[PDB]
A paper describes a structure:
The CP folds into three jelly-roll β sandwiches. The B and C domains clustered at the 3-fold axis. The structural variability of CP subunits within a capsid was very low. GFLV and TRSV are both transmitted by Xiphinema nematodes.
of a GFLV-F13 particle is viewed down a viral 2-fold axis. 3-fold and 2-fold symmetry axes is 155, 137 and 123 Å. ligand-binding pocket at the surface of the GFLV-F13 capsid. be recognized by compounds of the nematode feeding apparatus. axes may constitute a ligand recognition site. surface of the protein capsid which may constitute a binding site for the vector.
Residue numbers in the entry:
A (entry chain CA), B (entry chain BB): 1 to 504
C (entry chain BC): 337 to 504
The structure:
Amino acid sequence: GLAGRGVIYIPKDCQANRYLGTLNIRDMISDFKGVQYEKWITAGLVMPTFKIVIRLPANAFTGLTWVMSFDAYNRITSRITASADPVYTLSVPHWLIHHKLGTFSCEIDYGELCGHAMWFKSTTFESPRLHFTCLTGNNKELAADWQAVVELYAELEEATSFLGKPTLVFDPGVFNGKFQFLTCPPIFFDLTAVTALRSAGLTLGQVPMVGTTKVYNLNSTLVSCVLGMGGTVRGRVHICAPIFYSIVLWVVSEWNGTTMDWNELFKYPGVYVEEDGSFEVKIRSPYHRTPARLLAGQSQRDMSSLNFYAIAGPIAPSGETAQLPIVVQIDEIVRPDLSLPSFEDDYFVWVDFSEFTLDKEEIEIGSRFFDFTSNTCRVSMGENPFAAMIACHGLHSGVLDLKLQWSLNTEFGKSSGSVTITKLVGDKAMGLDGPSHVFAIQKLEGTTELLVGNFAGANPNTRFSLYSRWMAIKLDQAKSIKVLRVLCKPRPGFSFYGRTSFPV
Amino acid sequence: GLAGRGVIYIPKDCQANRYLGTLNIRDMISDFKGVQYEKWITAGLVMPTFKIVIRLPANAFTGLTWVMSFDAYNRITSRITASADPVYTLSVPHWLIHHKLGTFSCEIDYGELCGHAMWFKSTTFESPRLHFTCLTGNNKELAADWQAVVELYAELEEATSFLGKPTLVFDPGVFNGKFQFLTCPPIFFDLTAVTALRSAGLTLGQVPMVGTTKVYNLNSTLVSCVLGMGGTVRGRVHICAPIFYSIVLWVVSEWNGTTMDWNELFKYPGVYVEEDGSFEVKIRSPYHRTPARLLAGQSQRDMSSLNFYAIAGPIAPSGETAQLPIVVQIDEIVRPDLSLPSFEDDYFVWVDFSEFTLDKEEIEIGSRFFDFTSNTCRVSMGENPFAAMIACHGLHSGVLDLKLQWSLNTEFGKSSGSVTITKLVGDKAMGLDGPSHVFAIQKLEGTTELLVGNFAGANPNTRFSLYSRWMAIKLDQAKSIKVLRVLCKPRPGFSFYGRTSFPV
Amino acid sequence: DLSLPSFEDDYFVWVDFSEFTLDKEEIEIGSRFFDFTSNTCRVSMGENPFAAMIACHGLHSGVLDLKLQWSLNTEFGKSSGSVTITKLVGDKAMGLDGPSHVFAIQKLEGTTELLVGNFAGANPNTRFSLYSRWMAIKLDQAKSIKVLRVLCKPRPGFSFYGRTSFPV
């Protein structure tokens, strides 16, 4: 039944990118309080399937399109409260809300989209939010300020387990070609132009940016798992303007620039788009595939692109001035021609330690896979899809096999000491002794396993304190080491929960 | 499920007649608030079946017995908060709570015991209460103050109708001989006495008193519907003392005094009582029946009584000092020898008006059957079982046939004017005109019907304002009237809801 | 979930006449159910659903049973005269004589039927002139009456035609 509610205020002038507000999902249920809220207190833990309903007067004369963004791990909130770049709002699970369609509804399986069960008395990891932003603005301001109502419907029952089912399990050789929640920021057409071109890059492994901020997300991370891709792009086009705006588009794929000859343009295999609908366009390339990521100094336009040509319009009655926005969603690469996977089932670099200033150095790892920092030596972190996947999920869990390699800074004959791997259960202070391991420095390499997890079952992508196994690397002659490299190779079944994003 | 809760506080010295507290049933549910409370808000109206549970550490060493009294219409609250005489606490539906039995439970069909459905937002008539009082005290104080927990369990669902099913329907010729909630105040035996007698009167139509206060109740009212009764009294006896107290009773019926000869006493048909249990004793009388009520200067002992003779004990270890209490419950008269009904299916006196001081007099009746007052004339109200039944229920509804009779104060030849019966729907100010009726004073009598009820379906036994038909008697030559008598005769199906009591 | 009906199948108040200024008073009813006016006495009209229904339809037709009740203004022993119910077919001038009826004032009550209708079949809610039965109440000692009350009870099948409204 109705479990919780909230209100979004809409400014009489709702421009593209306006932050409209954030609702806190747990507060919606607890402020309402709530037949469902009271069932929750008894259950303790709930893994709801929500129906979210946004009540909203339908109107075809505004052109307004909003985005509801499900931010279960509070990753974009900080960055959108002034203004919400679409790159942020579309980097987490989200839904387009078209004003022409009025009242909106969708399902959120909290087991999938989030991954951990909700505790009645307090937030466990971070507090789950719904963000409401404006993707395409109104063509002219409306008569007055107004509001929309957000409602949560659910039948809460006691959760049997803490963890959901994993959204993703790590596998280098597996990127199907199907996507979810891959929405391109809006493309705009001026009505003061008789024709026009808008390119969308198809180099989908590229990490999106907002100014100097990189926004890592699961989709670009997935694509990066492959060297390149060919095939047909299946997607949907939304025309986000008032009924009295209209346009006709020729949508086609081109390689390295665009032709300047209108007649050549129409000898290509494209499709016409007059209205909201799906489309399929073949990725066009001399190699039949476009590369997954760019090299130094190449552009996305240098490769295969999805080109939107306005061949008639846009038109509108006078005196409208608003641009006509097109929102593109990419659903999958059908009939895919994939390259080799970019990585094999092999080790990859986690971290290099170098330039040691003290002979005694102790690197605490504990039960986490994360970015190191040191005041006493130089840390160089690895960048690879696995690390990105860690960053683009709320929770993860698994086992990493480690290979340690090191070279000497001093003469081999003078060398002494060891790379020691301390393995405990608990912490340095009260822990139990596991398979700790002393590698004489002359071995020049060593191996160990690392449990990434804890008694609860999964790690957040932050610092946390939960009883688990505990690991540390101890150097006693660190100045004799030119470099200590740590490689890892996830054991099968390394699991990720709740897709999200990670701005840096 | 658990719907509401509350706490009663017990003093280390809990003496007979201590008032322990009152819980407000609706507050218990709303303060808890409550999966059931929230279901209630949606239903609007509920007609619950409650399971009441009193949690209570069982103990055989105290002698403590409490009474929970269900006072849905707030009739005894005022009178028990200083001291709670058992006459008040047992005059409404109630339950004995024996300390030796520990945790206590019972069902309350709110449809029967109360009669009207509960409105989520506010009290409709009066606010339903549970009173907790001590019936028999502890033999010696306990070690410390303590508490008991009261719990309401219910599965609230929306009520289809406002009114329950009627507890009682008026019928002069119908008193079965079965009782509910007929509990006699505790009888006490001193342990400083080798034998003893305690009489319980069997003149059950007599109205119980607390000081100068009459406590009208349904049971005595029922018995008054008959001229007398013979047969066998079936009941239960509770011995309300610690396991280390014990007694043996000879229980027998006697007429007009008691025999002084122990040998004669045991030639009577009595029963022995050694412990908690049921009993059957024949009502002994020269006429085989004892009268339902007393005449002037008669005494309850002059008739048939139920006598409790302590023939062995009570005994207790030294140095106990408490008396041993016996609580008697009367369940029915089995194999009943009833007298004629005291009333036939006929009219009875509602009210006499006399001694008018003004020629213009207007008596407003409206839609109620109630006690009149006047500053301008003498009101003499009738006392009969019907009036008592009105007083001993929370709600009632039905139709009364009225006969009006009057005699002249002036000479007949000089007489003028009328007894006018105004009949409206609504009120004097905005009402519609019904079967109003002008009786020329010389008619000397007249008849009319009166609806006792309203749009909601029933009347409380208080002043209330609910749209209904409206009646008034209008005199224009009142000084010419020596007496205006109004008789009434309830039409079949006159209904009463929720048995209760009425102290005056 | 309905309440009781507000009215039962019973009489209700049509009109009270009171405060008579002349001993000779004659109230013409004819064949209509309507609001009375008098220059010589006080008219108090009843308000009930039946009267509203009469007002909220274009035409109506039926039969009303009447109960007349009255109380005296003078001393009973001095009373004389009558409440007379004149019943004609036609009009006062050329009519035929029906069940006219003389109630000695001392009876203090009387009954009669009234046809609400006419040869055409129904009455408008206005004044009209259509041949029908004709009724009048005749007082000869009206100053001796404190109040004359007229109750009516429609016989089954009292009919209304054409729903409408009535602003006042």
